[PDB]
């Protein structure tokens, strides 16, 4: 199942979409600068691109780390990003009451992994009718993603993206089960699956991120998700592999 | 470090405290019945007791599943429990806004394991000044507990309990690392460590719960956390606690080293 | 099911048996000194005791680190231990050819974890008719122990001990699943289950917490190593604590 | 570091080599037939190929299960394979005493995963001077492989291949850490690393799964792939495409 996000088609058989940006929104000027860089690189390579940032990050490393500019100013910034570059945007939400006003502006709303089972947030997100990115918790098996999908469906929204971020592997370390992508596709109706390489790696380097991104994209994925000419060299390699993989028909039976 | 909860002393070298009750509050009458049984049994065995229940099941499999009585009715039930039995109570909170009204009634407020990283909820809980039970996520190592403790300390609340519930082990399975208890004691300032045997078995029986509870308490813990239904069958509670008390008494009588 | 090892009764509802000794037999006099200390401490506390050592360490840190004294001299040392102290002994075997000559002298023979699926060794060990200790591989689940047991049974030997050594937990880390003891008892006919606390680790407070936790589940024995690994002089204090817990547990009927 | 195996160049920046064949040798005729198929498919795709089989099944579900043909008869069969097809072969050894006679015939000798820390078998294998394939145990981390490599080096053999077969993941399951390949390259002197996809899937062996997993591993730039209506060819076509692309990009 493909999802149209403005003029982008997101799907496990479509050219990969890059989701990237900055961790937390700080100011209009700084956001536009970082976004302009992603936009310039992705436009040069012909890669569809969706700008990501948090306006109110609830799982910060310290209680006083900056949460972001907050909802009202954050949405103003996202409007400006959309107006300037004509690209879609994605942001996370953590309170039910935020979902509607965020969804007025942000094309894709994201369900944090730690909130993935919180029924009230699932419902409030579903009811926006917007495209939703579901971050897969590290302790959930790929066959359990269907239960989250089922709750969104009950609440009336099927425009769901499944975002891999690795799996708990003993203490601290995460490992990405390359077989999990296929399991999610088979059990969740072939919804777009994207790969958050960055999270998957923070518990373990450019060479690593490249190996791990390439390995995942070799399984045929709708997109690559990054958390905060290097970007260019990286994306050239990902695009090479993605173009190859996507040009070949799915093996048939 | 010990924590006083009314007349209870909770600590890793004190007689174990039972945190027991039910999954979710369903009615006043059922709650009082179950509680009365836990109270009668614990009083005769001389085990300090704190009644546990959730007022809301926030993460059920279906949007349409029964969720429990809710905050306003739930707090009314907890008030009645406290008035009738004179014991402390514990419940979980899932939204920052709930922390203050819950804390007015409930002696211990609990941070759900799935929410342990939710910084706004930590801060809201800390600011109540109540005793807090931190459920250790299945995906977090015992040496990472200190980062959660640090957050509560930076927010001004040091009355913290660390609650083991097992660790992720492959897909859809949990294992309890009996060494993790000592790691949490050594890295988190010897705050009280308790063991949720019920949720540690989620992915696996009476015999199993006893073996696991005995093993954990053998490491010298402040408390045991469990659920029953009329989860262990409620009528087996007394026999189960006799065994746990026997072991706890023995362990706590031996000097540390 | 209990197993008689000379005058010792080994079983999940019997007083625990200590299996202890050293890593590798390196010399006679030092072996006897160490054994003497285990004997004195276990005799004082009334704990049945089986002396453990390897004569041929097949998995060494370096290719030329000393393997140990080898079969012929190792068995002579075991005979001397048996003659001097009148206790049983346990050692591991790595090759089918070693099973007979080791079984003639040693009261328990041990199947190394890394060799647990090697059918020729299983058969050769089974055919000795000796008591066998099966070391559970860190990658095998407790419900897969029955398959090793089955192979010993097919080969005609039911005098089997199952020995927990922990489970692989991510990289380089082991966890002991306290529920695995019960799974092994329920699936393998209540054969004696013993706990190798030493190999389950990789320090004193940790070994004690882990040993107590395990023994709380009701086990036939505890398996450990010391160095002249727990320090040998703290042995008494350690065993006092284990015995206290074992005595309490075993004095209570199984919850039925 | 590359390894020459007759006319094959095995290395992490060389075209991938397929190591493939069968579980256990059962008879001369069925071996030749299977080998002929691998040869025909690999030759037409232009993929270097090494034939794999065991002469003995050392871990049998039953004491009375069939064990395979054994050393003497097995080595006869391997000699016939080499003579008929002019390819190298690989087999595993389980006892020190077997290493020299096996090594006279078999181009690559393999250290079984369960025996990787058996020092006497390491030494005996090293002393053959043959190319050795070291199967990484499911319970050993990638950073520990350097200790095995060190032993073989001390014993005088540097012609080592490191073979990934997955890592223990809870009970009765495996997962393959795609970052482990890089760890092994970086810590073991860039020795050839190959991927045993077959054994990595033991606990899951669907065709779509094997392909996804093989493609993912080969995306990390490996020396080879190890495995046991025209499934092999369809699979190899896709693997070769990806390998050619990855190998054509310069290392960063
Ligand atoms: Cl997570
Ligand atoms: Cl709970
Ligand atoms: Cl959890
Ligand atoms: Cl092992
Ligand atoms: Na004997």
Which ligand has its closest atom nearest to the C-alpha of B168? 3
Best mutation site among D61, D62, D139, D164 for testing chain C: the one with the most C CBs within 10 Å? D139
Distance of CA D39 to the CA centre of its chain: 17
Q: What technique determined this structure?
A: X-ray
Task: Please tell me the distance between residue C201's alpha carbon and the centre of ligand 4 in angstroms.
Answer: 12
Residue C63 CA to residue D154 CA, distance in Å, equals 8
Any idea of the CA torsion for D182, D183, D189, D192, to the nearest 10 degrees? -50
**Residue with the two structure tokens 């994605």:** A90
Beta bridge partners of C135: C163
Alpha helices in A22-162 (DSSP H): 28-45, 71-85, 99-103, 119-127, 145-154
Look up residue D53 and give its two tokens: 């089989």
Residue C192 CA to residue D171 CA, distance in Å, equals 22
Q: Which DSSP state fits A143?
A: G
Residue B191 CA to residue D34 CA, distance in Å, equals 65
**B111 Cβ contact partners less than 8 Å away, ≥ 6 residues apart:** B92, B93, B121, B122, B125, B132, B133, B134, B135
Q: Distance (Å) from the C-alpha of residue B209 to the closest C-alpha of chain C?
A: 9
DSSP C175-242: E--TTHHHHHHHHTTT--EEEEHHHH---HHHHHHHHHHHHTT--SEEEEEEE--EEGGGHHHHHHHH
Do the beta carbons of residue C249 and residue B247 sit within 8 Å? yes
Task: Please tell me the distance between residue D61's alpha carbon and the centre of ligand 5 in angstroms.
Answer: 27
Query: Closest Cα to residue C218, out of C197, C190, C189?
Result: C190
Task: Please tell me the distance between residue B69's alpha carbon and the centre of ligand 1 in angstroms.
Answer: 29
C134: three-class secondary structure by DSSP: strand
Question: Which residues of A lie inside 8 Å of D (Cβ-Cβ)?
Answer: 167, 169, 175-179, 181-182, 201, 204, 206-208, 210-212, 214-220, 233, 237, 240-241, 244-245, 248, 251, 253
**B136 Cβ contact partners less than 8 Å away, ≥ 6 residues apart:** B113, B116, B142, B145, B162, B163, B164, B165, B184
Q: Which DSSP state fits B37?
A: H
Task: Please tell me the distance between residue C6's alpha carbon and the centre of ligand 5 in angstroms.
Answer: 10
Q: Distance (Å) from the C-alpha of residue C213 to the closest C-alpha of chain B?
A: 4
Any chains having at least 3 CB pairs less than 8 A from chain C are: A, B, D
**A253 Cβ contact partners less than 8 Å away, ≥ 6 residues apart:** D207
Cβ contact B120–A154 (<8 Å): no
Report domain extents, chain B.
1-257
Alpha helices in B104-140 (DSSP H): 119-127
Query: Closest Cα to residue C223, out of C110, C125, C144?
Result: C110
Do the beta carbons of residue B69 and residue B39 sit within 8 Å? no
Do the beta carbons of residue C217 and residue C22 sit within 8 Å? no
Distance of CA D129 to the CA centre of its chain: 18
Residue A163 CA to residue B219 CA, distance in Å, equals 39
Query: Closest Cα to residue A136, out of A125, A147, A124?
Result: A147
Cβ contact C120–D64 (<8 Å): no
Resolution (A): 1.9
Burial class (CB in 10 A: 0-12, 13-18, 19+), A45: middle
Tell me the CATH architecture of domain B1-257.
Alpha-Beta Barrel (3.20)
User: How many CB atoms sit inside 10 A of residue A214's CB?
Assistant: 27
Look up residue D250 and give its two tokens: 């310069």
Distances B251 to B244, C21, D158 between C-alpha atoms, Å: 11, 26, 55
- From D59, D115, D167, residue closest to C119, measured CB to CB: D59
> Which CATH superfamily, name and number, covers A1-253?
Aldolase class I (3.20.20.70)
Cβ contact B173–D169 (<8 Å): no
Say which CATH topology domain D1-252 has. Answer: TIM Barrel (3.20.20)
> For residue A50, what is the enclosing H or E element?
strand A49-54
Q: Which residue of D has its CA nearest to B175?
A: D170
CA geometry: angle at D46 spanning D44 and D49, to 5°? 100
Do the beta carbons of residue B182 and residue B152 sit within 8 Å? no
- Beta strands of chain C (E only): which ranges? 3-5, 8-10, 17-24, 49-54, 89-92, 108-111, 131-135, 160-164, 167-168, 174-175, 193-196, 221-227, 230-231
Do the beta carbons of residue B174 and residue B200 sit within 8 Å? yes
Cβ contact D171–B171 (<8 Å): no
User: How many CB atoms sit inside 10 A of residue B207's CB?
Assistant: 14
Tell me the CATH architecture of domain C1-256.
Alpha-Beta Barrel (3.20)
> How many Cβ pairs within 8 Å bridge chains A and D?
90
Look up residue A139 and give its two tokens: 């302790």
Query: Closest Cα to residue B159, out of B243, B80, B96, B222?
Result: B222
């Amino acid at each position: 199942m493909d999802i149209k996000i403005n003029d982008i088609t997101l799907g496990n058989n479509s050219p990969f979409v890059l989701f990237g940006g900055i961790n937390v929104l700080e100011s209009l000027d700084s956001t536009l600068q970082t976004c302009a860089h992603y936009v310039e690189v992705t436009r040069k390579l012909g890669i569809p691109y969706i700008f990501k940032a948090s306006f109110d990050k609830a799982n910060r490393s310290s209680i006083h780390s900056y949460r972001g500019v907050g909802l009202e100013e954050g949405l103003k910034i996202f409007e400006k990003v959309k107006a300037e570059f004509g690209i879609p945007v994605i942001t996370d939400v953590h309170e039910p009451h935020q979902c509607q006003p965020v969804a007025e502006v942000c094309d894709v709303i994201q369900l944090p992994a730690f909130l993935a089972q919180q029924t009230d947030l699932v419902v409030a997100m579903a009811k926006t009718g917007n495209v939703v990115n579901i971050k897969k918790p590290q302790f959930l098996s790929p066959s359990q993603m269907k239960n989250i999908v089922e709750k969104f469906h009950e609440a009336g929204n099927g425009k769901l993206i499944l975002c891999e971020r690795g799996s708990s592997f003993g203490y601290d370390n995460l490992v990405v089960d390359m077989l999990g992508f296929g399991v999610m596709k088979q059990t969740c109706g072939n919804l777009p699956v994207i790969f958050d390489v960055t999270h998957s790696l923070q518990t373990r380097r450019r060479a690593q991120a490249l190996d791990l991104a390439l390995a995942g994209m070799a399984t045929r994925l709708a997109g690559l998700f990054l958390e905060s000419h290097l970007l260019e060299d990286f994306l050239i390699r990902i695009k090479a592999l993605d173009d190859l993989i996507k040009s070949q028909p799915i093996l048939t039976i």
